Design a protein around this ligand. Structure first.
Ligand SMILES: [Ca+2]
Ligand SMILES: [Ca+2]
Ligand SMILES: [Ca+2]
Ligand SMILES: [Ca+2]
Ligand code: NA
Ligand SMILES: [Zn+2]
Ligand SMILES: [Zn+2]
Lengths: 106, 106, 106
């Protein structure tokens, strides 16, 4: 449900970044990604729906989103200094982390 | 500090930022806000005292402080580059989020 | 990695930062510290091995690594601006936090 919609939002803004030209477009898209990742962090993903809220699996899930958030931050920092090409290359690796998380927990 | 005291710290420093003259005052206030938001993640609002510490409700509460922390980060990054007016405008957005969290959990 | 090996990594990279000659070296060390701290967030330290993963003590432990992560970020923000000496001074606060965490949780 809502976790899946957050995953899709992350992918949409990744495509937005991959087809961007100036630094402010990349920044806007990464900011939307950060918001979607934070919204997903509080969800219970489909694979873990049968586990206790107190399970170590859910803590690992949430810390994985913290890792994604610091990767988003690095891309955003590159974009905020006008390094558009480097920001887009960092976002290419974000595609991996985002969709690996998607595929791990769906 | 308990949750209400940490929220008071957030609001006191939002006022300091609103009335600030230079970048050093804004940076000091935002650093205090960051410390308060992190400390608040260890607290429990009175209406959630009967919930499990990792219940979805308490996860939502802690991740709401993560959302605040990333908005604080944006404002502090602006203040660190001497962008005082942009940092104050971002702190005005911070007040909205702080108020919404206050209303949600008090 | 387990908690102790992550603490080893944090201490090793604090030494690297202290002796570092340029911004690339400081950025690399701080990035490794960030990774070790995020990994340690999924661990259980020796003092809390008799506590539940979702106990209040373990939530407080994870928030302590969030605090460290934001201090790492401050030093990394300085290094990203080429302010090597200021970043090393900031890493003095990391040493205090890391040492206190070692003493509290070993
Ligand atoms: Ca009060
Ligand atoms: Ca209640
Ligand atoms: Ca060892
Ligand atoms: Ca060693
Ligand atoms: Na070593
Ligand atoms: Zn947690
Ligand atoms: Zn930053």
């Amino acid at each position: 449900a809502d976790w899946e919609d957050n995953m899709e939002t992350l992918n949409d803004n990744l495509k937005v970044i991959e087809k961007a030209d100036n630094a402010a477009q990349v920044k806007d898209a990464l900011t939307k990604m950060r918001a979607a990742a934070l919204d997903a962090k509080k969800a219970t993903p489909p694979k873990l729906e049968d586990k206790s809220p107190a399970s170590p699996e859910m803590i690992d899930f949430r810390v994985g989103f913290d890792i994604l958030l610091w990767q988003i931050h690095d891309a955003l920092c590159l974009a905020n200094e006008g390094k558009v090409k480097e920001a887009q290359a960092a976002a290419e690796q974000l595609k991996t982390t985002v969709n690996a998380h998607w595929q791990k927990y769906r």
